[PDB]
Amino acid sequence: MKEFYLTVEQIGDSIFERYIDSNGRERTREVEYKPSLFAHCPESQATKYFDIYGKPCTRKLFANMRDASQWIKRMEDIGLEALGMDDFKLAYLSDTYNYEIKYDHTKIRVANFDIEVTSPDGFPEPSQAKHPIDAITHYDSIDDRFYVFDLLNSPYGNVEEWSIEIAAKLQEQGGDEVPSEIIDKIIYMPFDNEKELLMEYLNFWQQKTPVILTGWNVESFDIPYVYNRIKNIFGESTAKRLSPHRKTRVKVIENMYGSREIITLFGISVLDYIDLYKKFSFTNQPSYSLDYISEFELNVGKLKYDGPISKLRESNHQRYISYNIIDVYRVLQIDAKRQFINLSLDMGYYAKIQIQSVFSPIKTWDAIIFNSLKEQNKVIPQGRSHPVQPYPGAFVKEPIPNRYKYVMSFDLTSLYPSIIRQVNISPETIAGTFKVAPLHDYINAVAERPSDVYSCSPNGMMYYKDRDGVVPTEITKVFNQRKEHKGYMLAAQRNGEIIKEALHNPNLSVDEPLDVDYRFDFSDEIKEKIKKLSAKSLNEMLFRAQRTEVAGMTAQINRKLLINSLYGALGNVWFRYYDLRNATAITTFGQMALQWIERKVNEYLNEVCGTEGEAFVLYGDTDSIYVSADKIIDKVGESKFRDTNHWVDFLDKFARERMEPAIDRGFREMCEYMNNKQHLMFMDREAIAGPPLGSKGIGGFWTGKKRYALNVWDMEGTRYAEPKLKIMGLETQKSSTPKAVQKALKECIRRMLQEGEESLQEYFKEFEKEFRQLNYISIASVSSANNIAKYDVGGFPGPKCPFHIRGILTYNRAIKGNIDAPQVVEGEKVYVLPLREGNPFGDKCIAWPSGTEITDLIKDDVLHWMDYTVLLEKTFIKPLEGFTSAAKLDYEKKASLFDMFDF
Ligand SMILES: Nc1nc2c(ncn2[C@@H]2O[C@H](COP(=O)(O)O)[C@@H](O)[C@H]2O)c(=O)[nH]1
């Protein structure tokens, strides 16, 4: 096995790298890199090494690493361009792993942890670590074990040990429900005092120094804390030991925040899972609380409990510890069905960057490219700083607030990267410039066609249609690769079927599984020798096909990500290959392509229906368009259908048959008009929506930009049993709306889209009546005290006070007769409730810690003085009104003269 690295780091004039050797052993190296740089030489040179612009370069070998840093500084000062990879780590890696990679993973020490601390006020400061760490869970990927560090004695109450068996019991058995398979994994360890707890943990670390490091919110909390705490009581001199190279760097951040430090641990690759998820989930979420995610992601949730989180140890150490183990597991479980860490491995291993650098598109891509060129003796530019310049972005049509029964949408595949490829946009393919007319004129083909030999953008640009641009040819490769791997992933799957089937008519003695590539399909030759196999040789044979199917796809996905992040790096100033023009070129082209096809579509359609100027294109956003089908349907009469579904196929066919070919054919025009290099602008149908047929429902309706809801039957061809609801921007998600109301509005909406006014009305009446009898929490509002709590503290209020913060002060004011039981409110997430007129608390609203009940000393008073109507209105009716207005509907039946009569 050809080795591979784990981590790299530059300290002084040397590279420090933990890597696995030939026979899988974690070793440490200190190499004094002799980095080489470049400078432009006069034409009359015997050289290879030419930049992306052709100009010749000569190599400059440095001997000593900081010499090169000096050198660079120098050239710049003079005015001379200094070329090459200014980042040496990356230089090293290419230079040392000059081959495709092949990494293991079972040989990579991913440590996953979560620490816990107790505090009167729910949150301690990672910055100063005043409070003792009381619990630490550390799952080790290599050992596949959970190490638990438990603090028996604390000034916040000493406690009893913990029971593995009680942890095992069911909910009703006063048990914690920790899953069996995990139970014999746990390695509990209790401790008297903190000094020992830490001490030991420290030793555990140096003994099993981690490579990747995860957790949930580990980076912003867990890590900074562990770090400081130890520093505080044992001195930084020793805290540094967390670095396998004992080098460390603190760094402060800001915002409303201010002193939010982050410690970079030299030697290890922190990869907070909250980010890891944020970036690759492909699913936009409203909150990132570990509960909510593990709930949607895995259905289960978080260990439920009584009382505030600052009490749980003091009030139920058994569960306190149990919950830690649960948490760490959650993540483990998520990474299993999502493979995020692995993916990270793959990605970084491809590009040859520090793993964490995965988070940065800039670093990632810069590397790739550098490598590509590197093997063709070309030289990369040099990072030039540029000013931030507010260029145009995606196009979003302003919709007409109304109801739209039948609707269907289409998607531009990949867009930005496709555009790049179509126009052949590159820093070194820039041909010229041209007199540019108002964009509007271009999307109408009114403006006169620019260059007769250049690929252009509507902003005035023109690029050569000859030389293949560094960037487009680069993307292309990746885009080819995904096609390649998606291919494999699919082969080992349908090949996986072949094995699963021949296992029912198993065994024909004692044999050997075979040397077969699993990436491609089988061949009758091997399809036969297979029937002849045993349940021992097969099965094992299956594992191999099952594992290559996982690999192939984990690689395929990798590509998908690259492609998406690319525009984001071009649009970024630190990008070595940045250029505002290229940037504005892309975005404006997109901007046009859309409204151009918008025109084309309306054009085509109202001609096919024999109508005039009717605009079907209802809305558009970035890469998608939403057409109105209302007309088409009425044309062939609603009654001519005998089945909700029956229509869907019709629209579907119409799309793929009439529409799509028209679209592409009308898109070709544009390609010639701008006279680009290839066609690449493809759009395919995707959603199809409308009310159930017979149902007096409305299908969909829009409130405004990015604010709409639709009843969907078909999506990208795959049909639905029950209609699904694509809700967008309409606050059924906004974490601020009461959990009760969120389900309530969702229903109203469904009742609108599928049933119609009549249905909606009766519901409104129901939840309205029952509203009063519900649990307060579910109907309370939620916001976060952005700690601007300071900004006011006149002990009392003081103008410009947001309603939010208004209630907080009135809480703390009345909290005065504390008893310690009232959990102090500290700069983070709250509840808030109305409060009728003349209430004895003063002010006219209260708020308290999220996820906590309210201290009985006042709780009942509060409830008594709740302003239900005010509540109802601001939280439920107002957002509701918004919807009804747009859809021309009424949620309250007005006077029918037939009232007063008894039918
Ligand atoms: N081709 C190329 N090599 C670079 C660049 N910056 C640094 N290098 C160094 O050039 C040397 C290798 O060239 P090769 O061995 O492939 O002919 C290595 O020391 C490599 O790290 C760059 O922009 N292009």
Instruction: Show the domains of the chain with their CATH numbers.
Output: 1-106+340-382 (3.30.342.10), 107-339 (3.30.420.10), 383-468+573-729 (3.90.1600.10), 469-572 (1.10.287.690), 730-781+866-888 (1.20.1280.300), 782-865 (3.40.1820.10)
Q: What phi and psi, each to the nearest 5 degrees, are found at residue 309?
A: -75, -20
Q: Ligand 1 in contact with 380 (CB < 6 A)?
A: yes
Q: For residues 322 and 27, what is the distance between their CA atoms, to the nearest angstrom?
A: 36
Q: For residues 628 and 701, what is the distance between their CA atoms, to the nearest angstrom?
A: 11
Q: For residues 545 and 517, what is the distance between their CA atoms, to the nearest angstrom?
A: 9
Residues 6+ apart with CB under 8 A from 258: none
Q: For residues 281 and 464, what is the distance between their CA atoms, to the nearest angstrom?
A: 38
Whether 608 and 658 have beta carbons less than 8 Å apart is answered as yes
Residue in the structure block whose two tokens are 């990072």:
383
Q: For residues 302 and 291, what is the distance between their CA atoms, to the nearest angstrom?
A: 5
Residues in the chain: 903
Residue 416 marked as a ligand binder = yes
Residue 560 marked as a ligand binder = yes
C-beta neighbour count of 392 within 10 angstroms? 14
304 CA distance to ligand 1 middle (Å): 57
Residues 6+ apart with CB under 8 A from 111: 138, 139, 140, 141, 208, 210, 211, 212, 213, 214
The secondary structure of 456-510, three-state, reads CCCCCCCEECCCCCHHHHHHHHHHHHHHHHHHHHHHHHHHHHHHHHHCCCCCCCC
Q: In 535-659, where does DSSP find H-type helix?
A: 537-570, 580-608, 630-635, 644-654
Whether 410 and 625 have beta carbons less than 8 Å apart is answered as yes
Q: Ligand 1 in contact with 55 (CB < 6 A)?
A: no
Q: For residues 542 and 535, what is the distance between their CA atoms, to the nearest angstrom?
A: 10
Whether 215 and 331 have beta carbons less than 8 Å apart is answered as yes
Residue 501 marked as a ligand binder = no
State how beta strands 50-51 and 378-379 pair. Answer: parallel
Query: Residue 447 in 3-state DSSP?
Result: coil
Choosing from 32, 33, 36, 58 the residue with most ligand 1 atoms within 8 A of its CB, the one to mutate for a pocket test is 36
Residues 6+ apart with CB under 8 A from 130: 124
Q: Ligand 1 in contact with 741 (CB < 6 A)?
A: no
Phi/psi class of residue 736: alpha, beta or left (left: φ > 0; alpha: ψ in -120 to 50)? alpha
Of 280, 314, 266, 348, nearest in space to 5 by CA? 348
3-state helix, strand, coil in the chain (%, to 5): 45, 15, 40
Would you state the structure tokens that stand for residue 212, as one six-digit string? 């990747």
Residues 6+ apart with CB under 8 A from 56: 40, 41, 42, 43, 45, 47, 49, 50
Residue 623 marked as a ligand binder = yes
Whether 308 and 823 have beta carbons less than 8 Å apart is answered as yes
Q: For residues 516 and 542, what is the distance between their CA atoms, to the nearest angstrom?
A: 12
Query: Residue 683 in 3-state DSSP?
Result: strand
Residue in the structure block whose two tokens are 């151009």:
596
Q: For residues 833 and 848, what is the distance between their CA atoms, to the nearest angstrom?
A: 9
Q: Ligand 1 in contact with 85 (CB < 6 A)?
A: yes
Residue whose CA lies nearest to ligand 1 atom number 11: 36
Residue 415 marked as a ligand binder = yes
Q: For residues 386 and 672, what is the distance between their CA atoms, to the nearest angstrom?
A: 34
- For residue 534, which amino acid is it? S
Q: For residues 478 and 455, what is the distance between their CA atoms, to the nearest angstrom?
A: 23
- For residue 195, which amino acid is it? K
Q: Ligand 1 in contact with 377 (CB < 6 A)?
A: yes
Q: For residues 137 and 189, what is the distance between their CA atoms, to the nearest angstrom?
A: 10
Q: For residues 198 and 713, what is the distance between their CA atoms, to the nearest angstrom?
A: 57
Whether 31 and 14 have beta carbons less than 8 Å apart is answered as yes
Of 679, 677, 670, nearest in space to 467 by CA? 677
Whether 191 and 320 have beta carbons less than 8 Å apart is answered as no
C-beta neighbour count of 517 within 10 angstroms? 10
Q: For residues 162 and 175, what is the distance between their CA atoms, to the nearest angstrom?
A: 12
State how beta strands 14-20 and 4-7 pair. Answer: antiparallel
Q: What phi and psi, each to the nearest 5 degrees, are found at residue 857?
A: -55, -25
- For residue 731, which amino acid is it? E
Residue in the structure block whose two tokens are 């029918």:
896
Of 550, 19, 11, nearest in space to 269 by CA? 19
Residue whose CA lies nearest to ligand 1 atom number 21: 91
State how beta strands 248-252 and 50-51 pair. Answer: unpaired
Of 848, 849, 852, nearest in space to 862 by CA? 848
Helices 580-608 and 660-673: angle between axes, nearest 10 degrees: 140
Q: Ligand 1 in contact with 84 (CB < 6 A)?
A: yes
Taken in order 472, 476, 479, 481, the sign of the CA dihedral is negative
Would you state the structure tokens that stand for residue 233, as one six-digit string? 């009581």
Residue 114 marked as a ligand binder = yes
State how beta strands 269-270 and 212-214 pair. Answer: parallel
The secondary structure of 193-229, three-state, reads CHHHHHHHHHHHHHHCCCCEEECCCHHHHHHHHHHHH
Q: Give resolution, Å, one decimal.
A: 2.8
Q: For residues 332 and 337, what is the distance between their CA atoms, to the nearest angstrom?
A: 9
Q: For residues 511 and 680, what is the distance between their CA atoms, to the nearest angstrom?
A: 51
Helix (H) / strand (E) containing 718: strand 718-728
Residue 13 marked as a ligand binder = no
Residue whose CA lies nearest to ligand 1 atom number 19: 36
Q: Ligand 1 in contact with 72 (CB < 6 A)?
A: no
Of 504, 533, 391, 413, nearest in space to 457 by CA? 391
Residue in the structure block whose two tokens are 């990436």:
519
Q: For residues 28 and 16, what is the distance between their CA atoms, to the nearest angstrom?
A: 7
Q: For residues 57 and 792, what is the distance between their CA atoms, to the nearest angstrom?
A: 62
Shortest-distance atom of ligand 1 to CA 377: 1
Q: In the chain, how long is the greatest CA-to-CA distance? A: 105
Whether 579 and 378 have beta carbons less than 8 Å apart is answered as no
Would you state the structure tokens that stand for residue 542, as one six-digit string? 């299956």
Of 535, 150, 537, nearest in space to 324 by CA? 150
Start-to-end C-alpha separation, the chain: 86
Q: Ligand 1 in contact with 523 (CB < 6 A)?
A: no
Residue whose CA lies nearest to ligand 1 atom number 5: 84
Q: For residues 896 and 874, what is the distance between their CA atoms, to the nearest angstrom?
A: 28
